[PDB]
């Protein structure tokens, strides 16, 4: 997270940290608890990940510290990539983890609501992006989960700053024309959460963007409301 501040325990209970174990155990991506066995993250997080057995999902974490060998985790039973996904820039950057265990909810870990297809007429004023990612380019993974409040821009304005990319209906952008605050390496797959009318909603998945917190180059996020049916297809299966 570029230009962000530290979160407090309990502030983003839906934020998970997704680790891989081979060759090393490292932090890979963000992700969001959306149900008691379901993590919603980005498709791109799994390039060259060809087995769920090497994934650890850690919930209730504030500090990337907190973990080592006897810390609890959730195993990933199944990786579900959107069938049309090729690359981040191309869209469909959405994936579900079906966990093996069931997540118990509490003050350090709760699900975040998805948007309602009949609420794309809400304009969200209060959006944050969270993550353990770089604070600048050429940094390393952060110990403490960072936060940064970011304004949505319209897809029309986003399209003008990404000439030569099709900014589809199923993407949404957020950044300061100033620059200065954004996601960066390590925050991808993380949530883009918007408080509105008492409740938090999962509005975007951190997917791609030109550099990090760059002037006139807002981050691009999977627009989660355009995939709710897709999510419900996979998570409510018979």
């Amino acid at each position: 997270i570029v230009g962000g501040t530290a979160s407090v325990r309990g502030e983003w209970p839906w934020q998970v940290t997704l680790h891989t174990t081979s060759p090393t155990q490292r932090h890979l991506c963000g992700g969001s608890i959306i149900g008691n066995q379901w993590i919603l993250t980005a498709a791109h997080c799994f390039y060259g990940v060809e087995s769920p057995k090497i994934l650890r999902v850690y919930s209730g974490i504030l500090n990337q510290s907190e973990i080592k060998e006897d810390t609890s985790f959730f195993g990933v039973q199944e990786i579900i990539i959107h069938d049309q996904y090729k690359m981040a820039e191309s869209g469909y950057d959405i994936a579900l983890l079906k966990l093996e265990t069931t997540v118990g909810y509490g003050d350090s870990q709760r699900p975040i609501c998805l948007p309602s297809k009949g609420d794309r007429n809400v304009i969200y004023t209060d959006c944050w992006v969270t993550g353990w990612g770089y604070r600048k380019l050429r940094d390393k993974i952060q110990n403490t989960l960072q936060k940064a409040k970011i304004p949505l821009v319209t897809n029309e304005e986003c399209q003008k700053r990404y000439r030569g990319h099709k900014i589809t209906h199923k993407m949404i952008c957020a950044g300061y024309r100033e620059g200065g605050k954004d996601a960066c390496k390590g925050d991808s797959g993380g949530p883009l959460s918007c408080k509105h009318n008492e409740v938090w909603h999962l509005v975007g998945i951190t997917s791609w963007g030109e550099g990090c917190a760059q002037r006139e180059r807002p981050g691009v996020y999977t627009n989660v409301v355009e995939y709710v049916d897709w999510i419900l297809e996979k998570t409510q299966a018979v």
Binding site: L28, A88, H165, S188, W208
Partner: peptide, 12 residues
């Protein structure tokens, strides 16, 4: 790495 700047925030 740096091959694509559209992927500076992804892993990789």
């Amino acid at each position: 790495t740096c091959v694509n700047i559209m992927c500076c925030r992804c892993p990789x």
